[PDB]
Amino acid sequence: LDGMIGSSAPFKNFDPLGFAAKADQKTLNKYRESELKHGRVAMLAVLGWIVQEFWHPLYDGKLSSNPLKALTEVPLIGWAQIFVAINVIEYLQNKIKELPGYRPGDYLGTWEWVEQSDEGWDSYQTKELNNGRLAMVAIAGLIVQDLITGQAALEQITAGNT
Amino acid sequence: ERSKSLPFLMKPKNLDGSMAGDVGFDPLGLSEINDVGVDLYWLREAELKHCRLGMMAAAGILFVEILGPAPGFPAGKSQMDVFWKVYAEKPSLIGASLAAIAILEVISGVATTQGRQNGDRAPGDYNFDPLGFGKDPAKFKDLQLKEVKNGRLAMIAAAGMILQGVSTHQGALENLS
Amino acid sequence: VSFIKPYRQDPFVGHLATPITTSAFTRAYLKVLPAYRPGLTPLSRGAEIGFTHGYFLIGPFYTYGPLRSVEFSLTSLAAGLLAAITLLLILTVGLSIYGQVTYDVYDNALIVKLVRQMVGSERTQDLPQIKGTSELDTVLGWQKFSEGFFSGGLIGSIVAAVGIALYSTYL
Amino acid sequence: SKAVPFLEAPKALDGSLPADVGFDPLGLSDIGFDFTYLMVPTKWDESRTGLSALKWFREAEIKHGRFAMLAVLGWVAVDMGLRLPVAKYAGYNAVQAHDVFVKSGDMTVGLLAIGFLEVVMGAAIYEMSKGSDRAAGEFSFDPLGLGKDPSKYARYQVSEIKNGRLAMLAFGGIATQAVLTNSGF
Amino acid sequence: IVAGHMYKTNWFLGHSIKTILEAHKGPFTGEGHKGLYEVLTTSWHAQLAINLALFGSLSIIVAHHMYAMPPYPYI
Ligand code: CLA
Ligand code: CLA
Ligand SMILES: C/C(C=C=C1C(C)(C)C[C@H](O)C[C@@]1(C)O)=C/C=C/C(C)=C/C=C/C=C(C)/C=C/C=C(/C=C/[C@@]12O[C@]1(C)C[C@@H](O)CC2(C)C)CO
Ligand SMILES: CC(/C=C/C=C(C)/C=C/[C@@]12O[C@]1(C)C[C@@H](O)CC2(C)C)=C\C=C\C=C(C)\C=C\C=C(C)\C=C\[C@@]12O[C@]1(C)C[C@@H](O)CC2(C)C
Ligand SMILES: CC(/C=C/C=C(C)/C=C/[C@@]12O[C@]1(C)C[C@@H](O)CC2(C)C)=C\C=C\C=C(C)\C=C\C=C(C)\C=C\[C@@]12O[C@]1(C)C[C@@H](O)CC2(C)C
Numbered sequence A: 001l002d003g004m005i006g007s008s009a010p011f012k013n014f015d016p017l018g019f020a021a022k023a024d025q026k027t028l029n030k031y032r033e034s035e036l037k038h039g040r041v042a043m044l045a046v047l048g049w050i051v052q053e054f055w056h057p058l059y060d061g062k063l064s065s066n067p068l069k070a071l072t073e074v075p076l077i078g079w080a081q082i083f084v085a086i087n088v089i090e091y092l093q094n095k096i097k098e099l100p101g102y103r104p105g106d107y108l109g110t111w112e113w114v115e116q117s118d119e120g121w122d123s124y125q126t127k128e129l130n131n132g133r134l135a136m137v138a139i140a141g142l143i144v145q146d147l148i149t150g151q152a153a154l155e156q157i158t159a160g161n162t
Numbered sequence B: 001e002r003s004k005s006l007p008f009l010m011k012p013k014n015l016d017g018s019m020a021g022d023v024g025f026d027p028l029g030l031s032e033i034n035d036v037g038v039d040l041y042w043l044r045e046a047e048l049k050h051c052r053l054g055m056m057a058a059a060g061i062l063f064v065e066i067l068g069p070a071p072g073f074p075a076g077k078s079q080m081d082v083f084w085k086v087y088a089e090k091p092s093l094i095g096a097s098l099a100a101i102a103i104l105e106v107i108s109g110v111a112t113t114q115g116r117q118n119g120d121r122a123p124g125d126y127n128f129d130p131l132g133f134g135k136d137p138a139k140f141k142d143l144q145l146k147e148v149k150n151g152r153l154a155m156i157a158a159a160g161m162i163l164q165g166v167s168t169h170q171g172a173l174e175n176l177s
Numbered sequence C: 001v002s003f004i005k006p007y008r009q010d011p012f013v014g015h016l017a018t019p020i021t022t023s024a025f026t027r028a029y030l031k032v033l034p035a036y037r038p039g040l041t042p043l044s045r046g047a048e049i050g051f052t053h054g055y056f057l058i059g060p061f062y063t064y065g066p067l068r069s070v071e072f073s074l075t076s077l078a079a080g081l082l083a084a085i086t087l088l089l090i091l092t093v094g095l096s097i098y099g100q101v102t103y104d105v106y107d108n109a110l111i112v113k114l115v116r117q118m119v120g121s122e123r124t125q126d127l128p129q130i131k132g133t134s135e136l137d138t139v140l141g142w143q144k145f146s147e148g149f150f151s152g153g154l155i156g157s158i159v160a161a162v163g164i165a166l167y168s169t170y171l
Numbered sequence D: 001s002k003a004v005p006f007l008e009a010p011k012a013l014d015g016s017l018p019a020d021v022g023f024d025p026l027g028l029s030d031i032g033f034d035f036t037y038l039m040v041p042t043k044w045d046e047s048r049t050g051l052s053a054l055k056w057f058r059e060a061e062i063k064h065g066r067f068a069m070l071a072v073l074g075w076v077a078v079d080m081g082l083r084l085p086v087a088k089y090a091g092y093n094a095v096q097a098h099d100v101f102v103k104s105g106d107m108t109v110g111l112l113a114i115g116f117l118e119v120v121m122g123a124a125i126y127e128m129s130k131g132s133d134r135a136a137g138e139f140s141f142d143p144l145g146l147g148k149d150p151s152k153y154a155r156y157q158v159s160e161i162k163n164g165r166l167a168m169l170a171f172g173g174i175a176t177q178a179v180l181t182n183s184g185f
Numbered sequence E: 001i002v003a004g005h006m007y008k009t010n011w012f013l014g015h016s017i018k019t020i021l022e023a024h025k026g027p028f029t030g031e032g033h034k035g036l037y038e039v040l041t042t043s044w045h046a047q048l049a050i051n052l053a054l055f056g057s058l059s060i061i062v063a064h065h066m067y068a069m070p071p072y073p074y075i
Helices: A025-054 A078-097 A119-149 A153-159 B040-067 B079-089 B091-117 B140-168 B172-176 C024-031 C042-064 C074-102 C111-117 C139-170 D053-079 D097-103 D107-130 D150-177 E017-022 E036-042 E044-068
Strands: none
Touching: A025 A119, A025 A153, A078 C024, A119 A153, B040 B079, B040 B091, B040 B140, B040 B172, B079 B091, B079 B140, B140 B172, C042 C074, C042 C139, C074 C139, D053 D107, D053 D150, D097 D107, E017 E036, E036 E044
């Protein structure tokens, strides 16, 4: 709800509940960090959901193609390694956050090269944000549908449980 | 400013009044093509060649179907299928006719391109007036108009006869009745 | 926008500021590594490097050595551990000779200033010159670095052997 | 506006077109796309200033109205008999005559002839886009001559567009109902 | 045949290779393909390089697909 990147045509500066009208710059940076992290994690989660459903080469097959079921089938020592890798990545991100000129979601340090941003750079950042938002909605829907129905995405669609 | 044939269309720029049969009927503006060696001269020469070929073909079909074939030639009343009967027994006639037409068409193309280049020959002109039917003017324009109209009608007729013979495998007047 | 620019505004260096050389991720990741982590003595840097290196070095020797075993064998583990320790010894010998022939300094970040201020009209290359201002760039610093590498390599190799034995036995 | 009074106007329905009352709730008469490019995909001519979507829509509406009027006349005719004085047209209603005649090679001939006429008059539309003074739906077709007396021409215009709208809706009903006033579902 | 109706030659129709190349810039590539059209229309050696490289690669691909799927009877 500022001159921040992420304002698109359907709803420009979409803050209907006024979360940003009262927040300071630090809280807004925190909100942008949370939104970008959620969007990236959700894009990965949606892609993994679908691909796992129609392709699970690892673990010598097995590891039932329905997600939320393979969640309880991974050896639980591979879960620990994924957890530790995510933790090390976020430790590195925390270290990045104290670098001078840091921008909320910018872990590549594009502020080093991008002074006086263009419209293409802002448009690409907005594209990433919008894809992340769509993936957040999609992954929430995926998890809820798999919980209530018990079938996965391409399985529920194939049968016709819509 | 509006074409005489199509009042809802502006006058085609390249068709003023000169050519016989000109009524401004160029809805697609094909007369303005000036590429791939195609222009108004080439289009008019092609139209006149088509007119003459269609006139000859329609006259031949009607003659053979009405008055019958010449002695020693096959019958059948289907002109699109009697060709293969002639070729089955007199292939040399067909081959010689094809070679003659090929040579005459090479000459025709050379003449068309030359007359287009050093403008001295009107499109479709081959100086073929052995009987002197079009020597004087004020009759040449009327003869050109008659030839163009008859040739367009015979073009349409000959295309119709070709399609009818290919599809129905019957004679033209056989399809008529 | 352009994501490649001359390094530090010098178009004549043989280097470029690409999204890999000078990215914030690269900065933080290289600044958390023992070789560049702030607040570490050269002995601590050497110890951490040796620990990590012995830890991942025992792996290939134990797994693919001349005395492998598809099951767990104490002889295979001992062979891999000894090979890793001897390789660490060879690396420590290389470090020692490299430091012996490279530096002649016992306290850096000062001698450079002393010869930039109080003149250096001597045989040079010890008073003047002096490449690098890190504590690793001294005779004393590199000696402690090699000592730490060697001790940490032994400790990390032993720890990795213990972990391998535990994983092969209790899993 | 004069219809749907709680909406002022689309933007381009000033009144320069006949049969204008202002009814356009969706604002379809403001699309910036020049639909002549659906015919000539490129600008082609440097003098092609462009054709407003409103004029293209008016031409389409007039053409639709004429098509629907002739269509309802034909569909009503084949419900009450009235077959062509020739064989192979016996009785097969209107819901089935279309397919049986598409089979018998003459609907293709009709398609070719209608396409020829459509191409000529679409060349007229393209010239209008180029900037000819010809108005939408004006093919200068007044053979019998009941088109003089400009007041009569304007009245007949509004009449033709209103009748075309009525005929469009009536044909939609007739084809949807499979005829009820003269036949059964 | 469809692919042959792509580039603008003599009518107001088709593509200009100069306009296509000059529009393909990027953050990592500076000016992008600007000037490549002038390079490939003024240097026979550049055209020979591209054509010969792709031609040899095509020959190797042909060699593979030949034995892989024998296209001739009794070969
Ligand atoms: C939130 C992300 C996420 C999570 C938690 C999982 C979780 C899981 N996946 Mg998976 N997957 C994901 C995304 C994810 N996936 C994506 C995006 C793809 C497409 C390439 C796949 C493709 C995939 C296949 C083909 C298979 C799994 C399988 C599995 C299961 C076993 C773990 C495994 O072998 O992973 C394997 C994961 C991969 C091969 C690809 C992971 C690539 C990661 C997500 C991208 C890089 C991450 C990086 C380290 C951190 C980002 C850096 C920066 C942005 C900060 C487990 C339930 C296996 C299974 O049993 O299926 C039922 C299996 O066979 N996944
Ligand atoms: C939208 C107009 C339209 C269309 C598509 C048809 C279609 C049809 N009618 Mg038909 N009809 C119409 C209007 C129409 N009618 C009108 C308005 C009347 C009353 C005058 C009739 C009276 C009528 C009778 C009496 C019969 C048919 C029949 C038929 C069918 C057989 C014809 C056929 O196979 O195609 C042939 C091809 C076409 C119909 C395409 C039309 C091409 C025209 C001829 C080109 C010229 C149009 C004209 C010049 C427009 C002038 C405007 C402008 C130039 C100024 C066919 C389904 C016959 C049948 O068996 O039906 C069950 C039948 O017996 N119709
Ligand atoms: C480069 C060139 C010439 C030239 C040049 C020059 C030389 C350089 C000089 C100038 O400077 C330029 C230029 C361009 O003019 C081109 C040559 C022309 C071509 C390419 C010739 C094409 C002729 C094809 C024809 C005319 C075939 C017609 C077929 C029929 C079939 C008849 C049937 O009876 C058959 C057989 C079976 C029956 O069941 C039924 C049917 C189907 C009706 C009707 O007849
Ligand atoms: C080309 C030709 C015939 C070609 C026929 C062909 C290809 C047919 C081939 C086929 O049928 C076969 C064979 C077998 C079938 O299974 C296959 C096909 C293909 C169907 C005849 C030319 C025939 C050519 C002829 C008759 C030429 C006559 C020339 C004369 C009279 C010249 C006179 C002059 O030369 C003088 C005397 C003095 C000069 O100064 C002035 C003039 C006037 C020029
Ligand atoms: C829906 C429709 C029109 C709807 C109009 C509406 C809602 C208008 C509403 C308003 O006016 C009111 C009420 C009041 C105004 O103040 C406000 C508005 C809003 C303006 C037309 C459908 C129109 C639908 C049509 C025309 C469908 C035609 C289908 C045909 C002709 C099929 C032909 C065949 O060929 C096949 C396909 C197969 C062959 O085998 C058989 C046959 C049958 C021969």
